[PDB]
Ligand binder design. Structure first.
Ligand SMILES: *[C@@H]1O[C@H](CO)[C@@H](O[C@@H]2O[C@H](CO)[C@@H](O)[C@H](O)[C@H]2NC(C)=O)[C@H](O)[C@H]1NC(C)=O
Ligand SMILES: *[C@@H]1O[C@H](CO)[C@@H](O[C@@H]2O[C@H](CO)[C@@H](O)[C@H](O)[C@H]2NC(C)=O)[C@H](O)[C@H]1NC(C)=O
Ligand SMILES: *[C@@H]1O[C@H](CO)[C@@H](O)[C@H](O)[C@H]1NC(C)=O
Ligand SMILES: *[C@@H]1O[C@H](CO)[C@@H](O)[C@H](O)[C@H]1NC(C)=O
Ligand SMILES: *[C@@H]1O[C@H](CO)[C@@H](O)[C@H](O)[C@H]1NC(C)=O
Ligand SMILES: *[C@@H]1O[C@H](CO)[C@@H](O)[C@H](O)[C@H]1NC(C)=O
Ligand SMILES: *[C@@H]1O[C@H](CO)[C@@H](O)[C@H](O)[C@H]1NC(C)=O
Ligand SMILES: *[C@@H]1O[C@H](CO)[C@@H](O)[C@H](O)[C@H]1NC(C)=O
Ligand SMILES: *[C@@H]1O[C@H](CO)[C@@H](O)[C@H](O)[C@H]1NC(C)=O
Ligand SMILES: *[C@@H]1O[C@H](CO)[C@@H](O)[C@H](O)[C@H]1NC(C)=O
Lengths: 114, 320, 211
């Protein structure tokens, strides 16, 4: 058995706690233990609650710092039922003026190597 | 890079150090590609703020979306068309070659797709610009007729005819995919190109590159360290060149895929989340609306267009 | 103004370009420390120790390694340059279509209905401030595709027919502004037998009270 070792961490500006993912292995062969499609995750608490993805692990699993590191299946967003009918229409009675930013690269530093 | 070149030989590994950071560079380059692939998927499919659902009763004025909507009886919750698309498209690990799983599972991609369809069907283009606003489907279609310069009474007066042409056209998509082996060639070609590149890379481990043997263990079992270092260096040179060739090709291919993903994301926004005036951007004919369907490592758009028919000659004048 | 002043990661897209280029150069320079199989990574050490025949062997090893390192760098720069060019082409397109005009393309010039955009320059990049109209405070109404009056089917010229529960009006689509249904804001097509969901209501003719 062989594979990569990856360390999951919140910034060192936030915490010194880490979780370790042993890629492609069963948790039995390694030497808060959770088996994922990406491998064996150790040091993170697995919960049934779902959140926006913070640090991606793979196959739907993400981790975040909430204190301890937790692992969870990521949410794709809030569920919303549109009140559809064959004679119902919704019309805005107000509006808001929104301003948003978009940032794009244009150029690089012009390097030259002799 | 280290395992590919040297396996678990410490003799080779120590020699490889003489070449500096080449392997760190190669590992970094491949990691960058892998990250991009999840970004590509996100930019295409995660364009919806909320997970929208259709009503329990599918009454849309004669329009039938059953072939594009999720089929609740199937464990994957894919649509009939998506299921068809998905049906149509070890030793590497042993040499240091692995495959990382996608961040978004196929189930999750299907969930995004069905949310986009529910949004479009129940609220038209409003959910793209802000809060979803419900409107009767026939009225939505009437608005889309106005968008192509056709009066709304044309839609209403021919509602049953239009719904029938639509339902039939969708049915033909179902039938065409079920009888055309080459339909998903664009996606299959990507799979084939990547497989070929990996198979080539692995096969290069069989090359001698001028050494007495392609097998590192044969060299180490036969020769003492001075003579062995000469033979090993030959294998390192060849194997490093092979890996560099692979990575460069993957970076170029990755760029091409990214361009395709950027286009797919643009079509999602302009064809699915709105009605497009751009000619031939959202299918041939005058664009009315589009519906996304997810596919293996890709996306399929079903473009609905208005195509003029049965023209007749008239006399005309610029003014009366 | 306030968001940029309190978000360290706001300009990540531009910082990433700076970081990637710095990393590539640092790697290239660090490769000069590699021996590549030679007795020394330092060319002056080789020349001070060995006569020209033996020295040529050691030098050739350094040339091979250093040439490979430089080729790797240049290839990566060409690939990165192409990516930047694509970004610049997109930025140029946005300048033309978002700043020098009003765009109908969905999500091309920000989220919502595009009104206008303003460019701001940035280090090795451009920032666009997109101004959009976003609908708010929606309310439910009853609707119909057509109104039946005097045996004729009437359709809205510009807006949509809505009811507040007791009275029918016509309104513009993106902003509730109910108006009395008249022959000035509707048009007639055929009779009331064809349209599914047609409702019965009065259609007013402004010259009626006059003549
Ligand atoms: C929507 O269209 C589908 C076909 O694409 C209809 O489903 C078929 O219904 C007939 C009976 O009328 C069955 O014999 C077929 O086996 C069904 N086919 C499939 C694939 O299910 C569906 O009934 C239509 N829905 C409505 C409301 O008309
Ligand atoms: C416009 O074209 C449609 C075809 O899409 C014609 O509708 C068909 O008419 C034939 C008889 O000529 C029927 O047998 C078919 O069942 C109809 N098809 C559908 C989907 O209803 C329609 O008649 C044409 N209209 C005009 C004015 O020519
Ligand atoms: C690091 O933490 C400090 C507070 O202790 C905070 O002010 C600072 O912004 C943080 N830096 C980053 C990059 O988040
Ligand atoms: C290893 O994990 C797999 C699931 O990924 C499981 O089916 C298998 O039984 C596990 N093996 C052992 C010895 O637990
Ligand atoms: C999550 O749910 C499973 C049952 O589906 C249960 O066995 C498990 O203990 C739960 N874990 C937590 C932290 O709730
Ligand atoms: C229009 O008239 C031309 C002759 O000038 C004739 O060849 C053509 O077939 C006619 N087309 C139609 C649609 O009637
Ligand atoms: C519209 O009506 C539905 C019930 O059909 C209700 O759930 C929804 O909140 C209403 N929306 C508004 C904006 O009034
Ligand atoms: C509908 O609008 C009319 C005219 O403004 C008004 O008199 C009537 O009371 C309104 N009906 C309801 C239920 O608000
Ligand atoms: C709308 O649906 C209702 C039943 O829910 C039906 O009575 C009514 O006639 C339908 N209206 C139209 C235009 O189909
Ligand atoms: C509308 O009025 C006509 C008579 O002018 C009548 O025949 C028709 O049934 C009415 N429609 C409804 C829904 O009451």
């Amino acid at each position: 058995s062989f594979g990569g070792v990856s360390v999951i961490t919140p910034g060192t500006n936030t915490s010194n706690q880490v979780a370790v993912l042993y890629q492609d292995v069963n948790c039995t062969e390694v030497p808060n233990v959770f088996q994922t499609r990406a491998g064996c995750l150790i040091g993170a608490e697995h919960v049934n609650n779902s959140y926006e993805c913070d640090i991606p692990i793979g196959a739907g699993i993400c981790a975040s710092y909430q204190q301890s590191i937790i692992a969870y299946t990521m949410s794709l967003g809030a569920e919303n039922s549109v009140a559809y009918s064959n004679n119902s229409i919704a019309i805005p009675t107000n509006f808001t003026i929104s301003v948003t930013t978009e940032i794009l690269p244009v150029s690089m530093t012009k390097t030259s190597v002799d | 890079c280290t395992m590919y070149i040297c396996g678990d030989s410490t003799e080779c590994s120590n020699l490889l150090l003489q070449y500096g950071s080449f392997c760190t560079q190669l590992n970094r380059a491949l990691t960058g590609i892998a990250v991009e692939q999840d970004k590509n998927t996100q930019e295409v499919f995660a364009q919806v703020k909320q997970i929208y659902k259709t009503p329990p009763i599918k009454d849309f004025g004669g329009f039938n979306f059953s072939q594009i909507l999720p089929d609740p009886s199937k464990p994957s919750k894919r649509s009939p068309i998506e299921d068809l698309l998905f049906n149509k498209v070890c030793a590497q690990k042993f040499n240091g070659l692995t495959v990382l799983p996608p961040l978004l599972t196929d189930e999750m991609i299907a969930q995004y797709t069905s949310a986009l369809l529910a949004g479009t069907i129940t609220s038209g283009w409003t959910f793209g610009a802000g809060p979803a606003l419900q409107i009767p489907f026939p009225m939505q279609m009437a608005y889309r007729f106005n968008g192509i310069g056709v009066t709304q009474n044309v839609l209403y007066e021919n509602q049953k005819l239009i719904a029938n042409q639509f339902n039939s056209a969708i049915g033909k998509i179902q039938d065409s995919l079920s009888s055309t082996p080459s339909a998903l060639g664009k996606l299959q070609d990507v799979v084939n190109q990547n497989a070929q590149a990996l198979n080539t890379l692995v096969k290069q481990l069989s090359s001698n590159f001028g050494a007495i043997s392609s097998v590192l263990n044969d060299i180490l079992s036969r020769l003492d360290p001075p003579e062995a270092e000469v033979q090993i260096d030959r294998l390192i040179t060849g194997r490093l060149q092979s890996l560099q060739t692979y990575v460069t090709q993957q970076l170029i291919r990755a760029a091409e895929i990214r361009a395709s993903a950027n286009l797919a994301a643009t079509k999602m926004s302009e064809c699915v989340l709105g009605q497009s005036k751009r000619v031939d951007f959202c299918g041939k004919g005058y664009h009315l609306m589009s519906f996304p369907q997810s596919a293996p490592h890709g996306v399929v758009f079903l473009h609905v267009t208005y195509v003029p028919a049965q023209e007749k000659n008239f006399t005309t004048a610029p003014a009366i | 103004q306030d968001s940029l002043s309190s978000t360290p990661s706001a300009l990540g897209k531009l910082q990433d370009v700076v970081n990637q280029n710095a990393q590539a150069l640092n790697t290239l320079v660090k490769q000069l420390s590699s021996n590549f199989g030679a007795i020394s990574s330092v060319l002056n050490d080789i020349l001070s120790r060995l006569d020209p025949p033996e020295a040529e062997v050691q030098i050739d090893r350094l040339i091979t390694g250093r040439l490979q390192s430089l080729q790797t760098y240049v290839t990566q720069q060409l690939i990165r340059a192409a990516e930047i060019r694509a970004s610049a082409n997109l930025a140029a397109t946005k300048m033309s279509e978002c700043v020098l005009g009003q765009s109908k393309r969905v999500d091309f010039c920000g989220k919502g209905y595009h009104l206008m955009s303003f460019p701001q320059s940035a280090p090795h990049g451009v920032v666009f401030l997109h101004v959009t109209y976003v609908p708010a405070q929606e309310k439910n109404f009853t609707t119909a595709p057509a109104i039946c009056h005097d045996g004729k089917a009437h359709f809205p010229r510009e807006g949509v027919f809505v009811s507040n529960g007791t009275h029918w009006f016509v309104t513009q689509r993106n902003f509730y502004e109910p108006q009395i249904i008249t022959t000035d804001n509707t048009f007639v097509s055929g009779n009331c037998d064809v349209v599914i969901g047609i409702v019965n209501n009065t259609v007013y003719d402004p010259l009626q009270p006059e003549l």
